[PDB]
Amino acid sequence: EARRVLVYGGRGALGSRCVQAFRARNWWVASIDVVENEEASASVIVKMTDSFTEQADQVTAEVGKLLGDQKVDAILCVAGGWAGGNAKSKSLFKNCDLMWKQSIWTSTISSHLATKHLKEGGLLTLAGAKAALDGTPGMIGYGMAKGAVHQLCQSLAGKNSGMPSGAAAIAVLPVTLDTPMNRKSMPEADFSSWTPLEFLVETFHDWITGNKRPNSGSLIQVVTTDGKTELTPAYF
Amino acid sequence: EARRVLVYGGRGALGSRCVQAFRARNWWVASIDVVENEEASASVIVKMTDSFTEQADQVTAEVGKLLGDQKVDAILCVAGGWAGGNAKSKSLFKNCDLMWKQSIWTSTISSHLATKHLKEGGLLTLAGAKAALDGTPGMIGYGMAKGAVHQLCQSLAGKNSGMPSGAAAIAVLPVTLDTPMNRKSMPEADFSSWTPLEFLVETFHDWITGNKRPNSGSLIQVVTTDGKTELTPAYF
Amino acid sequence: EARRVLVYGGRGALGSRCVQAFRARNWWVASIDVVENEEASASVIVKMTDSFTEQADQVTAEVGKLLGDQKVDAILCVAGGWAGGNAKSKSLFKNCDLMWKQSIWTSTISSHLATKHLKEGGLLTLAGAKAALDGTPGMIGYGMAKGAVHQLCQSLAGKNSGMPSGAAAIAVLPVTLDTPMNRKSMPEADFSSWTPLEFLVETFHDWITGNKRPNSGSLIQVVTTDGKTELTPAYF
Amino acid sequence: EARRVLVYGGRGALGSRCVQAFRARNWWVASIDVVENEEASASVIVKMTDSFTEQADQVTAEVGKLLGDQKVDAILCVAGGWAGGNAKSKSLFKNCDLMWKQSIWTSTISSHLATKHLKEGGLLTLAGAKAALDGTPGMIGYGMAKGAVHQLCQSLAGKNSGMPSGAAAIAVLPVTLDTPMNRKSMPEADFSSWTPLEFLVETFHDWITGNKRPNSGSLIQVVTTDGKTELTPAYF
Ligand SMILES: NC(=O)c1ccc[n+]([C@@H]2O[C@H](COP(=O)([O-])OP(=O)(O)OC[C@H]3O[C@@H](n4cnc5c(N)ncnc54)[C@H](O)[C@@H]3O)[C@@H](O)[C@H]2O)c1
Ligand SMILES: NC(=O)c1ccc[n+]([C@@H]2O[C@H](COP(=O)([O-])OP(=O)(O)OC[C@H]3O[C@@H](n4cnc5c(N)ncnc54)[C@H](O)[C@@H]3O)[C@@H](O)[C@H]2O)c1
Ligand SMILES: NC(=O)c1ccc[n+]([C@@H]2O[C@H](COP(=O)([O-])OP(=O)(O)OC[C@H]3O[C@@H](n4cnc5c(N)ncnc54)[C@H](O)[C@@H]3O)[C@@H](O)[C@H]2O)c1
Ligand SMILES: NC(=O)c1ccc[n+]([C@@H]2O[C@H](COP(=O)([O-])OP(=O)(O)OC[C@H]3O[C@@H](n4cnc5c(N)ncnc54)[C@H](O)[C@@H]3O)[C@@H](O)[C@H]2O)c1
């Protein structure tokens, strides 16, 4: 059930594949990002600023004029990334602002675009990370941004949150996805414990089209061991 | 057993009461807030800026000079505030920008200053909220903020976080505090279910001065019933 | 407010999604169909027979054993199915026999169990159709099978019926539920007028957890215009 | 203006009287029922079976053999009966089954026979009931069955049901007919209200001979107050 999709983080490794395969199946796919994704039906360009309200208003404004009264089947917020740093760090403040702008800013503008552009029965997927289900001493910024996003699921799953009737919020919780960049930077890493980008496209495919879709509020873990990926509930 | 205290959020309702209880015991108290505290030993002024890196680098420069080589006993992060609104509200991006600046920008800089300026065995307290242990649909922004602080507290409590030996990070999680503004906003409320500011200040002295302090990464729910307040832990 | 639910029709398209969401809500869901449902907490297997009292006594008996002295919060009766044909049709006697078996046999056994097994205050939902509120000249068996279910919903709402005190028998009148088979079967159709199953699962959830439940003997029309689904009262 | 007629249920209280009277007129009258009516020109005897398709294929092929190329002028389907019991009852299933057999099966086979045999401009009359225009809590099987017959009658009045051009299907809906066994089961009732079979043979005869005929799909309530009996439209 799905010929309309919004991918926040459209040019980034996983979002890019979601743009590629939903077009291979003739869905209209649109990419919200800091750059244009030429393979998308359309791209919306996010404005670099320090003002959350200023980037928030320009993005919500231009998805306004692009969709008009067209609702979407799914918004997949897959924007995100990584920066390390413990609390004693040099870089703690540079990385915290990078992380907050990458997951807490993007998941909050997407949530709003959900309450306005999203179908009843539709789907908002949020980008969590399983590291954050506990203390992340070595990456304050990361854990904080993604633990914020897991609390946000619980809230959109809540009575009177703004989510369209029958639509759902599901935070996907990876350990390490498997991108060319990750392979380049973490060379001697067991790539067989990284999830393939395709298993998440496959998963958003079943979920978007009613197939075995998990309750709103759901924090779904994605663990790959030796090539085999597993989806497991986490409870907040 | 303690004498040197930082209060982040020093001119707020709990912040002022901490300067007063402690100043009148002849503790050295410095206040950090966007304005001055004439009843504190010292005042650091927080520069209004949308740049988290602007403000952090500043507070860490000014606190860093005040203290020089003196390790303080306890840093109390009691900055904060409150703003409602679900994902559909029009003022959401503004109300989220406030709640992150008051609760996410301030609890992070205080985690940083604690790795740099805190005594071995000393204490950092962060201000969380019991409401955000669950989903907060009627207040998207506020539960992201406080949800991120409960996660930060788990992080500082762990291996190689940056905290000094024997130093505890503890999050206090109130349901409602008895303030003049709560009275004036929720005028027809049952004020006996509110936690009196004085309970927390009596509690901050007990944990500060060695007597009865809990573990680092403790989330301590603060609940007051018919004037009687008990404290009970939450697990993450 | 509901943990125990019987889904008469547990393997069909809508009743299936009801065993999924409610077991993921850790409710006790017992499927009642012509085949076991492996996701349910229980299965009563309806023995195929041209004798009404044989199907009706083996179901009442197997469900009567399965629960014993326990009462259930709800009996969702979503069994039904469809076949066409006018009064001249050579498939008339086959189709008619199947529709009266799928909707009158199952509605009358679900009634009877509610009087014996529905918790005081509980829900029974019967499966109806918007179509059958007027004449159905192209599907005689169907409009005559649903129309009898609409008249049953009223009799249950009547004084001295057997219905448990405080309980409600509500009927649901859909035009087209969006489902797998309807997209494989009706393929150039406008899906924007088709109800997403996830909206009826959420509604069943409201009505079962006491929230916005309509009165007993209500004919609720479910109608989706442009993706927005609405519930309106029909009067018999 | 009419001389061949089938009387379905033709051996029962109004069924017998339509035979006797249309015969006093010399109309060729055929009686369908589970015993032969020796007063009519030809009697079909319905096989007592559980399979709807077994009985329906047998009654259709016997009426079919008897008439061959002959179109009839009016099928008066006056078969039926009565049984009590609300949804909690012991006898619920037996009587539901009996009432479906008597009033739902018989009426669906009449309708298939009118499309095959009724003349253009001819008449099909179905036995409905005032009681079932609303809920019937004490008699669940009876109101389901008669509620099924009211719907069928709008379906047959509709476009391409298969009814011969100009023909009509009109449901008659009594409160109580004055019958001998009604006098035995109800010995003290005010019979001045019990409609007399006679008034419906008088009326069937007018409708059959085009005199003041209701439109097709009309539902005629028949209410007798104290010696006059009025026919008034009911609506779906
Ligand atoms: N190895 C992993 O990729 C990995 C590991 C753990 C968790 N997950 C998480 O799941 C999600 C999917 O993984 P990913 O590889 O696609 O992340 P990613 O880093 O590859 O994608 C980042 C996207 O965010 C965009 N961008 C950055 N800030 C933006 C902003 N404020 N507004 C609009 N665009 C912005 C970038 O242009 C980019 O398209 C991520 O959020 C990630 O943190 C992934
Ligand atoms: N009923 C309540 O007031 C209540 C209930 C539950 C939780 N809390 C939480 O408990 C804590 C203390 O309670 P409070 O009522 O005294 O709050 P408060 O607002 O009265 O005091 C906090 C002070 O922190 C300052 N602060 C805001 N932004 C800052 C920034 N960017 N840099 C430095 N300081 C900044 C504000 O100026 C304010 O004066 C807060 O974290 C609050 O959210 C309060
Ligand atoms: N588009 C639609 O699917 C649509 C439209 C209008 C109304 N409805 C009505 O809403 C209800 C649910 O829709 P649906 O698509 O899920 O129906 P469905 O046909 O897909 O499912 C009916 C299920 O109940 C079972 N059922 C049939 N006879 C049974 C019996 N005698 N004993 C026990 N179970 C029996 C069937 O085996 C099947 O698993 C149906 O009753 C249907 O009539 C559906
Ligand atoms: N008090 C009333 O007389 C009254 C009230 C309301 C409605 N009506 C309805 O009007 C109709 C005619 O009135 P009635 O009193 O003469 O009913 P009746 O019981 O006296 O006669 C009905 C006849 O239909 C036959 N019928 C039952 N099963 C049949 C079958 N399987 N195949 C063919 N025919 C079958 C019965 O054998 C019987 O011969 C009935 O259906 C009745 O329910 C009558």
DSSP one-letter string for B154-189? HHHTSTTSS--TTPEEEEEEES-B--HHHHHHSTTS
DSSP classification of residue C85: B
Protein residue with its CA nearest to atom 5 in ligand 3: C176
Evaluate whether D149 touches D213 at the Cβ level (below 8 Å). no
- b/e per residue, B104-135, with b = 16+ CB within 10 A? bbbbbbbbbbbbebbbeebbbbbbbbbbbbeb
Structural domain including D37 reads 1-236
Measured distance CA(A155)–CA(A171) in Å, rounded: 12
**CA angle in degrees (0–180, nearest 5) for C34-C37-C42:** 100
Integer angstrom CA distances of residue C224 from B145, C186, C187, D93: 38, 17, 18, 36
Q: How far apart are CA A173 and CA A235, in angstroms?
A: 12
Backbone angles phi, psi at B72, to 5 degrees: -75, 155
A160 interfacial to chain C (CB closer than 8 Å): no
Which residues are registered as beta bridge partners of D224?
A: D229
Per-window interface: D 15-44 vs C, CB < 8 A: none
CA distances from B150 to A26, B121, B208, C105 (A): 43, 21, 20, 55
What is the rounded distance in angstroms from the CA atom of residue C152 to the CA atom of residue B20? Answer: 73
CA torsion A35-B56-B104-B182 (nearest 10°) is -130
Size of interface A-B (CB pairs under 8 A): 175
Tell me whether residue A28 is annotated as binding.
yes
Tokens of D174: 């009594």
Per the listing, tokens 């901490």 go with B18
Read off the amino acid at residue C52. F
Provide the number of structural domains found in chain C: 1
Whether residue A92 and residue B114 make contact (CB cut-off 8 A), yes or no, is: no
Q: Could you count the other beta carbons within 10 Å of the beta carbon of residue B60?
A: 16
DSSP letter, residue B139: B
| Domain harbouring B31, CATH code | 3.40.50.720
In SS3 terms, B35-103 reads as CCCCCCCEEEECCCCCCHHHHHHHHHHHHHHHHCCCCEEEEEECCCCCCCECCCCCCHHHHHHHHHHHH
Q: Given the residues A46, A78, A125, A142, select the one marked as catalytic.
A: A142
**What whole-number distance in Å separates Cα of residue D62 and Cα of residue B115?**
99
Long-range contacts of D53-60 (CB under 8 A, 24+ apart): D53/C93, D53/C94, D53/C97, D55/D105, D55/D109, D56/C93, D56/D105, D56/D108, D56/D109, D56/D112, D57/C93, D59/D32, D59/D109, D60/C93, D60/D109, D60/D112, D60/D113, D60/D116
Indicate the angle between helix axes C52-67 and D92-99, nearest 10 degrees.
150
Q: How far apart are CA B112 and CA B215, in angstroms?
A: 19
Q: Which token pair is C197?
A: 């199953």
Residue C77 and residue C153: Cα distance in Å, rounded? Answer: 12
Does chain A reach chain C with at least 3 CB pairs under 8 Å?
yes
How far does CA B118 lie from the centroid of its chain? 16
Q: Residue written as tokens 């030996």?
A: B165
Tokens of A65: 């004029």
From the list C17, C178, C202, the residue facing A165 with the nearest CB is: C202
C21, C119 Cβ separation under 8 angstroms: no
Cα gap D124→D102, rounded to integer Å: 17
Alpha carbon of D227: minimum distance to chain C alpha carbons (Å): 31
**Which of A120, A210, A215 is facing C227, going by the closest CB pair?**
A120
Per residue, the 3-state secondary structure of A168-224, as one string, reads EEEEEEECCEECHHHHHHCCCCCHHHCEEHHHHHHHHHHHHCCCCCCCCCCEEEEEE
The answer to whether residues C160 and D86 touch, using CB atoms and an 8 Å cutoff, is yes
CA B224 to chain centre: 19
Q: Would you tell me the crossing angle of helices A92-99 and A140-156 to the nearest 10 degrees?
A: 30
| Count of Cβ atoms closer than 10 Å to residue C185 Cβ | 10
Closest ligand 2 atom to B79 CA: 24
Write phi, then psi, for C67 (nearest 5 degrees): -100, -25
Q: Which of B100, B112, B138 has the CB atom closest to A160's CB atom?
A: B138
* Per-residue CA distances from C79 to B39, C10, C108, C128, D235 (Å): 74, 8, 12, 10, 29
Distance CA B85, CA B79 (A): 20
Cβ separation of A121 and C197 shorter than 8 Å? yes
For residues A55 and A63, the answer to whether their CB atoms sit within 8 Å is no
Residues C5 and C22 sit within 8 Å (Cβ to Cβ): yes
Question: What was the elucidation method?
Answer: X-ray
Helices (H) and strands (E) in chain D, counts: 7, 10
Count other C-beta atoms under 10 Å from residue A175's C-beta. 15
- Interchain contact B/A (3 or more Cβ pairs less than 8 Å): yes
| Beta-bridge partner residues of A146 | none
**CB neighbours of C222 closer than 8 A, spacing ≥ 6?**
C130, C172, C173, C174, C175, C195, C199, C200, C229, C230, C231
| CA of residue D100 relative to chain centroid, distance | 14
- Interior angle at CA C154, CA C153 and CA C157, nearest 5: 95
* C125, β-bridge pairs: C76, C170
Tokens describing residue A229? 């990926």
CA angle C155, C159, C164 (to 5 degrees): 85
Mutate to test the interface with C, among D98, D106, D144, D146 (most CBs of C within 10 A): D144
DSSP single-letter state for residue D47: -
Strand (E) or helix (H) holding A65: helix A52-67
Q: Is A30 annotated as a binding residue?
A: yes
Query: Chain-centre distance of CA B155, in angstroms?
Result: 16
**Residue C37 vs residues A163, A209, C9, C13, C109: alpha-carbon distances, Å:** 31, 21, 10, 12, 19
Give me the residues paired with residue D6 across strands. Answer: D30, D75
3-state helix, strand, coil in chain C (%, to 5): 40, 25, 35
Output the residue whose Cα is nearest ligand 4's atom 21: D12
Amino acid identity, position C154: Q
- Contact indicator for C76, C4 with CB cutoff of 8 Å: no
| Resolution of this entry, Å | 2.6
Interface contact C128, partner D, CB < 8 A: no
Nearest Cα to Cα of residue D106 among D46, D181, D39: D46
CB atoms within 10 A of CB D124: 29
Dihedral of alpha carbons C84, C88, C91, C97, sign = positive
Q: Are A136 and B155 in contact (CB under 8 A)?
A: yes
Quick check: A1 contacting C, CB < 8 Å?
yes
From residue A210, alpha-carbon distances to A203, A220, A232, C197 in Å are 11, 16, 18, 8
B174 and B195 Cβ atoms separated by less than 8 Å? yes
Task: Identify whether the C-beta of residue B100 lies closer than 8 Å to the C-beta of residue A103.
Answer: no
Tokens for B27, please give them.
């503790």
Binding-site residues, ligand 3, Cβ < 6 A: C 9, 11-15, 32-34, 46, 78-81, 101-102, 105-106, 127, 129, 174, 176-177, 179, 182
Q: Cα separation of A167 and A165, whole Å?
A: 6
The single-letter DSSP state of residue C139 is: B
Q: Are D17 and D198 in contact (CB under 8 A)?
A: yes
Measured CA to CA, the distance from residue D86 to residue D91 in angstroms comes to 9
For residue C53, give the amino acid letter. T
Query: Other C-beta atoms within 10 Å of D144: how many?
Result: 28
Instruction: Report the distance separating Cα A194 and Cα A174, nearest Å.
Output: 9
Q: Which amino acid is at C50?
A: D
Tokens for B110, please give them.
């205080």
Q: CA C191 to CA A8: how far, in whole Å?
A: 25
For helices B197-208 and B13-23, the axis angle rounded to 10 degrees is 50
- CA distance to B69, D12, D191, D228, per residue, from D186 (Å): 107, 18, 9, 21
Q: Name residues whose C-beta falls within 8 Å of residue A24's C-beta, 6 or more positions apart in sequence.
A: none
Query: Residue for token digits 């492996």?
Result: C38
DSSP character string of D87-140: TT-SSHHHHHHHHIIIIIIHHHHHHHHHHHHEEEEEEEEEE--GGGGS--TTBH
CB atoms near residue C129 (< 10 Å): 24
Q: Does A72 touch chain C (CB under 8 A)?
A: no
C28 is in an annotated binding site: yes
8 Å CB contact between B142 and B129: yes
In this structure, are residues D14 and D25 in contact, taking their beta carbons and an 8 Å threshold?
Answer: no
* CA–CA gap between residue D38 and residue A44 (Å, rounded): 86
C-alpha A194 to ligand 4 mean position (Å): 75
C42 to each of C33, C59, D3, D143, how far by Cα in Å? 11, 13, 61, 33
Q: What is the DSSP string of A116-156?
A: HHEEEEEEEEEE--GGGGS--TTBHHHHHHHHHHHHHHHHH
Task: State which amino acid sits at residue B49.
Answer: T
Rg (CA), chain C: 17
Note whether B93 contacts A53, CB cutoff 8 Å: yes
Question: Cβ–Cβ of D156/C136 closer than 8 Å?
Answer: no
Strand, coil or helix: what is D18?
helix
In this structure, how many other beta carbons lie within 10 angstroms of the beta carbon of residue C221? 18
